[PDB]
Design a protein around this nucleic acid. Structure first.
Ligand SMILES: [Mg+2]
Lengths: 409, 414
DNA sequence: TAATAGATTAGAGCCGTTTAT
RNA sequence: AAACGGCUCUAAUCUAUUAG
C-alpha cells in the first residue's frame, strides 16, 4: 500500500493582512487585497446587449445565492465584497447597429479610449472572435471582459424545449462571484495574492500553442509574456531558450531588484537536453533552475474506498524523487464538496530537468493553483503558471504584448 | 453595555447573518450571535440580550418574520428596551425584498434595509451606530478571521484521519519468463497482419516479438513449422522490466515498449473471449457488458448496466499497460450507451451527452464500485485476470487495484 | 512515402454546475 | 467568450520496427 503525502492547503492574503484559503470567503470577509475605489464600465454591443448588461449590473449589486451556499459561497453583492461601486449608472455605451466583427468591436473600443474595463457584450445572433479581439486590443492596452448575452441573461435564451441552454441557476452566485472578480482584476485591483510567497523563487509557465508551426509562450508569475513561433516541435532552440530565460530573469530582477535564488519553469511538455543547456548557460550560478512538467489526465484515479466522496485535494502520490501525482482537485474540506465532478484527475508533476525537492514543487504548484484571477473559484486544477501561460499564448497566436494578465484573461 | 446582538432565522438566514456579524467584528464591534458559538442556551441568550446587549439587531426577512426563537428574543429585547428607555435599542434589518409592507411583525414595522444592497445597508447600520453612542474597538479584522476559522470552518478542515484509496492501476502479477523473438524469415508473410494472430505478436526487425512459444502460430501461419527455435532470441522479462537488458538487438526502452504493446494486444484479445462487447473510443477500445449478460444487470451487487430514459448505459472500461512505477494496467472508466442494451448508438454526440448525463450523479463510490466490479467480472481465477500471450504463457493482472493510504482525510458530508 | 505500436503532445467541442439543505 | 472541471473526439510529433 503506497503512502500518500498531504500538501497543506496554501493561504491567500486579502485586505487588512488577513489570510484564508477561499478567494470567495476572503473577499467577502476582509475585502480585496488591492482596493480600487470604482469601476467605470464601457459597454460595446447592441441596445439589447446594453440592456442585458445593465440588468445584470443591477442584479449583481444585490446579493446572489447559489443552489448550494455551503458548497459554493454565495455573492453578498459587488460593493459588499470589493468596497467599490460597479454600477450601470457609470456606463459609457458605444452603440452597435470574424475579422470584420473584431474590427467593429475593436474600433468602437479604441475610439473612446475614462473607463476601468471595457465590456464587450456579444449577441448570440465565430471561433476566433475572442482571441483576435483580445490580441488587437493588446497594443492599445485596453482591459476588456467579453460577456455573451446568454451569460448575463442566461434565462432569456432557451432551446425549443424552453429550458435555458446554459443552466446557471445552481451557480448564479458563483457566476456573479467570477464576473465580479474578473471585472475587479481588469479594473486594476488584485483581489488576493499568495499568503506565503517564497522569496527569490521565480515561476514560469512555458506552453506551446499550435498556430493554425508551434509558438512557444512563457508567462512569468509575480507574487510577464514571452512569444516566439517556431517549427512543429514542443521544444526551444538554443537561442530561443536563452532569450526566454534571459527575459524572465531580467523581468524578475527589475521587479525584485535581485536575481531569483530558484527558478521553476512549468510546462506541459518535457524539456530536451539542448534547450535545458541553453537555459542553464544564461541563468546565474547561484540561481537553481528547475524544469517542472505538469501533465493532465494521466490515467490515475484514486478512489476513496470507504465513502461516496473522492480523495481530498492536496493529497500527493510521490512516485519518484522527481515524479509525483498531485491532487489539485478533489474534496475540499472547507467547501465540504469537490472541485471536480465524478472522480478527480490528479496532475502528474515531473521534475524533468534540474534538482528540486518534489514535495516543495507540489507545494508550490498547489499554491499557484490559487492565483487564477480569471475565475473566482476556491482553487484551480492546474497552477496559474500553466493556465495563464496558455491563456496569453492562445491570445498572442491570434495576432510587444503587455505584461499585465488582465489584457489576456 | 457593549455587546451587539443579532437575532435571525437560524436555518435559512445564515449567509447574511454570518456576513454582517463577521463584518461588524472586523470593525471592532462586540457582536453576539447564535452562529458564533459551538456546542451551545436560552438563559445565556436572554442574559446577553437583557444585560450585556447595547444594540439589538434583527434580520427582518420573510422567513425570520415569524419565528419562535426570533420572536422570543424580540420580546426579551423589547423588555430591555423599555427598561433602558432607548428609542433605537432594537434595530430591524430588512434584507428580504419579498417581505412586503405591513406584513412584518407589529413591533418591527413602526421601528435599516439591506434589500437594495448589503454595502448600503451596512453603511446605514454603521452610521446609525455612530449617531448613537454604540461602543466599538479599533478595527481588528484579525479577530474576525480567527472567529471565522474557529467557528465557520471548525468542522470543515483536513483532519488526521487514516484514509485508504483504491486506484485505477491494477498490478500485473507476473509475466512470462522469456520474451521471444522468433526469426520467421519467410514463414511469416511480409503482408501478413500480425495483429490477426491468435496471440499478441509484434513484427520487430527480422523477428516476431511475442511471449508465445515458437510454434504457437501454427494454425494462422502454416509455414511456422520446420522452424528451428535456436535462432529465436530469448530475453528475460525481469531483465527488460528492471532495465538490466540493453543490447544492440533491441534497446531497453524499446523492449519495454514492445512488452507494453504485447500487454495491450493481449488484453484486446482476452476481451474477445470475455463475453464482453467492444466500443471504439478515440484512442483505445472500451469494453462494456450488454443488457442481459449479467444477472439483473448486476455483478456482485454492483450495477454495470442500467437505464437512462429511453437509453441503456453500460459501464465500460479501457485498459492500457504501463511499466514505469510498477507493471500495472491503467483502467479508464467510461459509460457506453445503447438503444436497447445490445445495439450501440452510432452517433458519438448522443453517446457523449448521455455519458455526461449519467456521470452527473456518479461519484467516488459509484465509479470505484463499478470499476472494481467490472475488473472482477473479467477475472479468470479468484484474484487475477489471465491474458493468453501464448499457449503456455499468461500475463496476470491483479484483481485488486493498487492500494494507497494517507494520514490526512476529512469527515464525510452527511 | 506508408503502416504497426507506444509515448507524448495539442486542439476542439460538449455537458454539468460538484452527492447536502 | 464568467469560469472550472469530467468526458468525448480529432489530429500532430517523437521514437522503434516493417513495407517501399
Ligand atoms: Mg476572463
Amino acid at each position: 500500500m503506497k503512502e500518500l503525502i498531504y500538501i497543506e492547503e496554501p493561504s491567500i492574503l486579502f485586505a487588512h493582512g488577513q489570510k484564508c484559503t477561499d478567494p470567495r470567503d476572503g473577499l467577502a470577509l476582509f475585502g480585496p487585497l488591492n482596493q480600487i475605489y470604482g469601476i467605470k464600465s464601457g459597454v460595446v454591443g447592441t441596445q439589447k446587449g446594453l440592456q442585458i448588461f445593465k440588468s445584470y449590473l443591477d442584479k449583481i449589486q444585490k446579493p446572489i445565492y447559489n443552489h448550494n451556499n455551503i458548497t459554493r459561497p454565495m455573492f453578498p453583492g459587488f460593493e459588499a465584497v470589493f468596497g467599490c461601486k460597479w454600477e450601470s449608472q457609470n456606463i459609457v455605451f458605444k452603440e452597435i447597429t470574424t475579422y470584420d466583427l473584431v474590427t467593429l468591436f475593436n474600433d468602437k473600443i479604441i475610439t473612446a479610449n475614462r473607463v476601468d474595463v471595457w465590456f464587450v457584450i456579444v449577441p448570440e445572433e465565430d471561433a476566433q472572435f475572442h482571441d483576435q479581439l483580445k490580441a488587437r486590443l493588446l497594443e492599445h492596452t485596453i482591459p476588456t471582459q467579453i460577456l455573451r448575452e446568454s451569460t448575463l441573461a442566461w434565462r432569456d435564451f432557451k432551446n425549443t424545449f424552453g429550458a435555458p441552454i446554459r443552466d446557471f441557476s445552481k451557480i448564479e452566485g458563483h457566476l456573479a462571484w467570477t464576473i465580479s472578480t474578473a471585472a475587479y482584476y481588469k479594473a486594476g485591483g488584485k483581489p488576493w495574492k499568495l499568503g506565503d510567497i517564497r522569496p527569490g523563487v521565480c515561476y514560469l509557465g512555458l506552453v506551446y500553442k499550435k498556430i493554425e508551426q508551434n509558438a512557444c509562450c512563457a508567462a512569468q508569475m509575480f507574487l510577464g509574456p514571452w512569444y516566439n513561433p517556431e517549427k512543429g516541435e514542443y521544444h526551444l532552440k538554443p537561442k530561443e531558450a536563452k532569450a526566454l530565460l534571459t527575459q524572465a530573469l531580467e523581468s524578475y530582477k527589475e521587479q525584485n531588484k535581485s536575481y531569483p535564488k530558484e527558478v521553476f519553469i512549468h510546462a506541459r511538455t518535457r524539456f530536451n537536453d539542448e534547450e535545458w543547456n541553453a537555459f542553464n548557460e544564461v541563468t546565474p550560478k547561484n540561481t537553481n533552475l528547475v524544469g517542472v512538467t505538469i501533465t493532465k489526465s494521466k490515467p490515475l484515479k484514486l478512489y476513496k474506498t470507504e465513502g461516496a466522496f473522492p480523495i481530498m485535494r492536496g493529497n500527493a502520490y510521490i512516485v519518484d524523487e522527481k515524479k509525483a501525482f498531485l491532487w489539485t482537485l478533489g474534496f475540499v474540506p472547507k467547501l465540504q464538496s469537490t472541485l471536480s465532478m465524478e472522480v478527480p484527475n490528479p496532475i502528474f508533476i515531473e521534475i524533468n530537468k534540474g534538482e528540486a525537492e518534489i514535495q516543495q514543487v507540489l507545494k508550490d504548484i498547489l499554491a499557484l493553483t490559487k492565483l487564477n484571477y480569471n475565475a473566482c473559484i476556491y482553487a484551480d486544477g492546474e497552477p496559474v503558471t500553466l493556465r495563464f501561460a496558455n491563456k496569453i499564448g492562445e491570445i498572442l497566436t491570434a495576432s510587444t504584448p503587455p505584461l499585465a494578465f488582465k489584457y489576456y484573461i | 453595555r457593549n455587546k451587539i446582538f443579532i437575532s435571525h432565522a437560524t436555518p435559512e438566514d445564515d449567509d447574511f447573518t454570518r456576513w454582517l456579524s463577521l463584518k461588524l467584528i472586523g470593525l471592532g464591534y462586540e457582536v453576539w450571535c447564535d452562529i458564533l458559538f459551538l456546542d451551545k442556551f436560552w438563559s445565556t441568550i436572554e442574559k446577553e440580550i437583557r444585560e450585556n446587549t447595547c444594540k439589538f439587531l434583527i434580520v427582518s426577512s420573510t422567513a425570520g418574520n415569524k419565528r419562535e426563537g426570533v420572536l422570543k428574543e424580540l420580546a426579551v429585547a423589547t423588555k430591555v428596551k423599555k427598561h433602558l428607555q432607548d428609542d433605537m435599542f432594537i434595530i430591524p434589518l430588512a434584507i428580504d425584498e419579498n417581505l412586503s409592507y405591513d406584513d412584518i411583525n407589529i413591533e418591527i414595522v413602526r421601528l435599516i434595509d439591506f434589500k437594495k444592497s448589503w454595502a448600503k445597508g451596512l453603511q446605514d447600520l454603521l452610521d446609525a451606530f455612530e449617531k448613537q453612542n454604540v461602543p466599538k474597538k479599533p478595527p481588528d479584522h484579525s479577530k474576525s478571521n480567527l472567529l471565522y476559522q474557529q467557528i465557520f470552518l471548525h468542522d470543515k478542515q483536513a483532519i488526521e484521519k487514516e484514509e485508504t484509496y483504491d486506484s485505477n492501476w491494477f498490478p500485473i502479477i507476473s509475466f512470462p519468463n522469456e520474451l521471444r523473438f522468433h526469426r520467421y524469415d519467410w514463414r511469416l508473410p511480409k503482408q501478413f497482419d500480425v495483429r490477426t494472430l491468435a496471440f499478441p505478436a509484434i513484427r520487430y526487425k527480422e523477428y516476431l516479438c511475442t511471449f508465445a512459444w515458437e510454434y504457437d502460430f501454427i494454425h494462422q501461419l502454416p509455414k511456422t513449422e520446420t522452424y528451428n527455435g535456436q535462432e529465436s532470441i530469448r530475453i528475460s522479462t525481469s531483465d527488460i522490466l528492471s532495465g538490466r537488458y540493453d543490447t544492440d538487438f533491441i534497446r531497453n526502452y524499446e523492449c519495454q515498449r514492445l512488452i507494453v504493446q504485447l500487454i495491450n494486444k493481449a488484453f484486446e484479445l482476452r476481451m474477445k473471449d470475455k463475453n464482453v462487447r467492444e466500443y471504439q473510443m478515440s484512442k483505445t477500445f472500451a469494453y462494456w457488458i450488454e443488457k442481459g449478460k449479467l444477472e439483473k444487470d448486476k455483478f456482485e451487487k454492483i450495477k454495470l448496466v442500467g437505464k437512462q430514459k429511453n437509453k441503456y448505459w453500460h459501464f465500460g472500461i479501457s485498459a492500457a499497460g504501463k511499466l514505469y512505477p510498477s507493471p500495472v494496467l491503467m483502467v479508464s472508466s467510461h459509460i457506453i450507451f445503447t438503444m436497447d442494451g445490445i445495439n450501440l448508438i452510432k452517433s458519438k454526440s448522443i453517446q457523449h451527452s448521455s455519458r455526461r448525463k449519467q456521470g452527473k450523479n456518479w461519484w467516488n463510490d459509484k465509479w470505484r464500485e463499478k470499476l472494481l466490479a467490472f475488473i472482477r467480472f473479467l477475472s479468470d481465477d479468484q484474484n487475477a485476470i489471465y491474458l493468453n500471450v501464448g499457449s503456455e504463457e499468461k500475463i496476470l493482472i491483479s484483481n485488486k487495484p493498487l492500494k494507497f493510504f494517507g494520514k490526512m482525510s476529512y469527515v464525510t458530508p452527511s
